[PDB]
């Protein structure tokens, strides 16, 4: 009956077969499922493509006010309220330009220069100092030089008061006000001109300083009437080149008493020892600290020479918001 002992062998395989049938059903179910998953992903594709299609928001561009005017004061008049980036356009200004307006007590100070941390090299050429360099931001925490042509055309429109804010490394603040501050055209170079020193607790550095090295120091460090000079364009009263020696763009006489565009030095106190120009190239204002003490923060701002002014109180505490 071996012939019948084989029939069981076939019989069992048939069993296997049905078992395999059930499996083939399970496989087809997977793909079936796979396939919907697939097309469900193909739907998430087209969708994600879309959601990741918008680009980032420029939050700085986003905060530049549409308000305008001759300067930041007009900007206040015409609406301006909060300090920040505005596009102003002076008289002969051929193309309006962006500036930082410091709006306080209805005053629209249009900012010209500002040192803050030392992130921007101020050793620049004549075009750079006339077209301007440095950076602008929604907050006055960036470093720049507006540009000499912009400052010329601006202080040309009407008479402006120049306020210079100085802060030392102990975060002590002091200012200096010069009335009718203005720059002559590029033809005359960019001569520094002001009627006089109004007031201020920092000192009158623009009128030279008795450094003590030689009786003629004050005369040779006064900036009134001085021509602008860069490291490659000498217009000083020195046999050498103050600007190149000090790597800056300033109104050098037989050099300087006030040097707001000098090299940034952290800590205030700094020494020469380095290259070979044993001369003070820091951010100084001699009527306060002396040549080897570079200020921590600095700012030169313009306000119409026809405004109130005195809204600062002083004497003691209680002068600090945010």
């Amino acid at each position: 009956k071996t012939v019948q002992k084989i029939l069981e062998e076939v019989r069992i395989l048939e069993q296997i077969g049905v078992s395999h049938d059930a499996q083939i059903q399970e496989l087809s179910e997977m793909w079936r499922v796979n396939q919907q998953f697939v097309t469900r992903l193909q739907q998430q594709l087209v969708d994600i493509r879309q959601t990741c299609s918008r680009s980032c928001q420029d939050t700085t561009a986003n905060k530049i006010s549409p308000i305008t005017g001759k300067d930041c004061q007009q900007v206040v008049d015409n609406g301006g309220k909060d300090s920040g980036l505005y596009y102003i356009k002076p008289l002969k200004a051929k193309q309006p330009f962006l500036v930082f307006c410091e709006i306080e007590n209805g005053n629209g100070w249009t900012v010209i220069q500002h040192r803050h941390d030392g992130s921007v090299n101020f050793t620049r050429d004549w075009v750079s100092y006339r077209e301007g360099f440095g950076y602008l931001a929604p907050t006055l925490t960036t470093e720049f030089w507006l540009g000499n042509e912009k400052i010329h055309l601006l202080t040309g429109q009407q008479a402006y008061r120049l306020r210079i804010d100085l802060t030392d490394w102990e975060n002590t603040h002091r200012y200096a006000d010069y009335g009718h501050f203005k720059l002559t055209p590029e033809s005359d170079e960019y001569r520094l001109f002001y009627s006089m020193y109004l007031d201020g607790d920092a000192g009158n550095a623009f009128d030279g300083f008795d450094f003590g090295d030689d009786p003629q120091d004050k005369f040779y460090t006064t900036h009134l009437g001085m021509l602008f000079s860069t490291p490659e364009r000498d217009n000083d009263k020195y046999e050498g080149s103050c600007a190149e020696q000090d790597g800056s763009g300033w109104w050098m006489n037989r050099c300087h008493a006030g040097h707001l565009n000098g090299k940034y030095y952290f800590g205030g106190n700094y020494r020469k020892t380095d290259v070979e120009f044993p001369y003070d190239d820091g951010i100084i204002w001699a009527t306060w600290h002396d040549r080897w003490y570079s200020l921590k923060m600095t700012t030169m701002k313009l306000l119409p020479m026809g405004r109130d002014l005195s809204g600062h109180g002083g004497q003691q505490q209680s002068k600090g918001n945010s």
Partner: peptide, 4 residues
């Protein structure tokens, strides 16, 4: 400063 000055450059004596």
């Amino acid at each position: 400063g000055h450059r004596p």
